[PDB]
Design an enzyme around this catalytic site. Structure first.
Site, short mmCIF file in Angstrom:
data_model
loop_
_atom_site.label_atom_id
_atom_site.label_comp_id
_atom_site.label_asym_id
_atom_site.label_seq_id
_atom_site.Cartn_x
_atom_site.Cartn_y
_atom_site.Cartn_z
N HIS A 41 70.63 72.81 28.69
CA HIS A 41 69.64 73.81 27.95
C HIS A 41 68.37 72.76 27.68
CE1 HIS A 41 71.61 72.49 24.12
NE2 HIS A 41 70.21 72.49 23.81
N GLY A 140 68.45 69.16 17.38
CA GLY A 140 68.14 67.87 17.98
C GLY A 140 69.29 67.18 17.93
N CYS A 142 71.87 67.71 19.85
CA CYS A 142 72.74 68.27 21.04
C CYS A 142 72.78 67.12 22.12
CB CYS A 142 71.85 69.24 21.81
SG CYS A 142 72.43 70.97 20.83
#
Ligand SMILES: *[C@H](O)[C@H](Cc1ccc[nH]c1=O)NC(=O)[C@H](CC(C)C)NC(=O)c1cc2c(OC)cccc2[nH]1
Ligand SMILES: *[C@H](O)[C@H](Cc1ccc[nH]c1=O)NC(=O)[C@H](CC(C)C)NC(=O)c1cc2c(OC)cccc2[nH]1
Lengths: 303, 303
Positions: A41, A140, A142
């Protein structure tokens, strides 16, 4: 003496963390040999993405990969389930011996929380029966990973993708397959009903005994069947005989048969601790596996 | 979202851990530049040692220093308070930017637990008011260190020497000076009376608020004086105005003045939580400093 929620030493994983930017999104990636793994993503801009299409548009140079100060040239890119794999022109010299593993609910691992490719801290947590983790993750984070260490081998098991409305966390194994029934869409997805990890509570009680907390040890015994009935009422996972056997070594160490400890836990669920504490805690702790207890109480080291 | 007891990334410290053997005793040392720091009782054989004398006997070659596989030639040796300093012929290429600091009771740091020069795991803990730590340390862990990280700088504050009869732990700063009134003798030494770190509990309540647990927030206010009286009864450190000021930034963030939170804590000490939990806990947590809360809730990273 003493029992703490200990995390694995993080240095082997620190040496693999990189920053990945696509357009305006920056998240963390995992650099092993000449591949950087990260959540796909990062190519979003997101309520329902068509990731295969977005990736046709993208060319290698669109991926800005920074290993500390150094930029790493992307020379190839591909997707595997929900993770992107960016081939880079340079193999990571700090790559450890490693495996990708898919853990089972009830098992534990350490999270190295990162932002912008840099570590913030490390902690130990459990994969919940509902395939979520009760972590500490901000936007952030991820691409932060979870892992175990076996001597010199880092077994990566978790990559962070999402925080649910409940404020628990969800992500994938390193093959991009989600734990539990979630998708990497900007949508609100509900957890699923969780339960307590019964085998881990019993391990934690043996840890208490090993350290010195024994007040909770009742004189009775019980059957596996009888215990599993009291458990169901308090939202406790069923204890199987595979579990009973995993507890054998602790049982042999402490002189306390597994079913006797099962009796002593059966009481606590019914009477509580009446203001008392086990290993400095006033709730029944379920994020230590039997292995975790033996590791910590034995001084097992890594390399 | 979520609040965990997070440790610092350990890699910078991992790269400094070595094994030190004198005769039959092997413990851990800290290799920075061309010096290895370790607890001096590695030269014991111990109910009352005369360390200055034992060290006259010892010559450099009597110290076996191993950095992983590599043996490091000792070319000089000296003592500073309770720590030995072994000059070696090789400077550690992995030495980080570092300071030696002496922390204050109430402050937190991460422990990297090691055996035979290798790490076992990492956790965060607090220097107790009685200058002990509630750690997880077995025999052979001596010389493990505690530390903080500020961006790229590792501030070493603790080296482990001893476990007390109570099963809490005691050690020195890196200048060899003990925290609290202990000595490095094989004798039983008693702790001293501990108390709860009041400023840290309040920080932890702001952390709860920031995350979403607010049930405990009472409508009243109170004076510093009035609060500090209720505290004394429950064995709570006195809250000073230096503390009140350290809490200002959290107070400004959450819209909750410090004295209002003081009222809301005053209640808990008097009524308990009645089966409720704050941030997944049922006791009042005192091992998070106000800085620790801001770090974690802000995503502060290291490098
Ligand atoms: C990746 O860095 C973040 C992780 C994160 C964000 C916020 C708080 N904690 C965290 O750990 N991931 C994301 O933001 C996800 C992006 C991808 C997978 C699309 N999104 C979520 O985690 C997310 C999205 C939503 C909603 O969107 C409608 C609604 C409710 C919850 C929610 N979580
Ligand atoms: C150094 O590796 C160990 C650390 C340690 C030992 C056992 C359990 N947990 C631990 O962390 N240190 C020591 O063994 C000390 C050696 C030096 C400082 C002499 N000794 C102790 O920590 C110790 C010694 C005693 C007694 O000796 C009479 C009695 C009661 C308690 C006690 N602790």
């Amino acid at each position: 003496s003493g029992f703490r929620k200990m995390a694995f030493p993080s240095g082997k994983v620190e040496g693999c963390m990189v920053q990945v930017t696509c357009g305006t999104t920056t998240l963390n990636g995992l650099w092993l040999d000449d591949v950087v793994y990260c959540p796909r993503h990062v190519i979003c801009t997101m309520l329902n993405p068509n990731y295969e299409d977005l990736l046709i548009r993208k060319s290698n140079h669109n991926f800005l990969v920074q290993a500390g100060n150094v930029q790493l040239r992307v020379i190839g890119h591909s997707m595997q389930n929900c993770v992107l794999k960016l081939k880079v022109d340079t193999a990571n010299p700090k790559t450890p011996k490693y495996k990708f593993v898919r853990i089972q609910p009830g098992q534990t691992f350490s999270v190295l929380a990162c932002y912008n490719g840099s570590p913030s801290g490390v902690y130990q947590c459990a994969m919940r029966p509902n395939f979520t983790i009760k972590g500490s993750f901000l936007n952030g984070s991820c691409g932060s990973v979870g892992f175990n260490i076996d001597y010199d081998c880092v077994s990566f098991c978790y990559m962070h993708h999402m925080e649910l409305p409940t404020g628990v966390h969800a992500g994938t194994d390193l093959e991009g397959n989600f734990y539990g029934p979630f998708v990497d869409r900007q949508t609100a997805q509900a957890a699923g009903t969780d339960t307590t990890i019964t085998v881990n509570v019993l391990a934690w009680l043996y840890a208490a005994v090993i350290n010195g907390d024994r007040w909770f040890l009742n004189r009775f015994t019980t059957t596996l069947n009888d215990f599993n009935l009291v458990a169901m009422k308090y939202n406790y996972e069923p204890l199987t005989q595979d579990h009973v056997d995993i507890l054998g070594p602790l049982s042999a160490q402490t002189g306390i048969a597994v079913l006797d400890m099962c009796a002593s836990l059966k009481e606590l669920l019914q009477n509580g601790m009446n203001g008392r504490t086990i290993l400095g805690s006033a709730l029944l702790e379920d994020e230590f596996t039997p292995f975790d207890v033996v590791r910590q109480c034995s001084g097992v080291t890594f390399q």
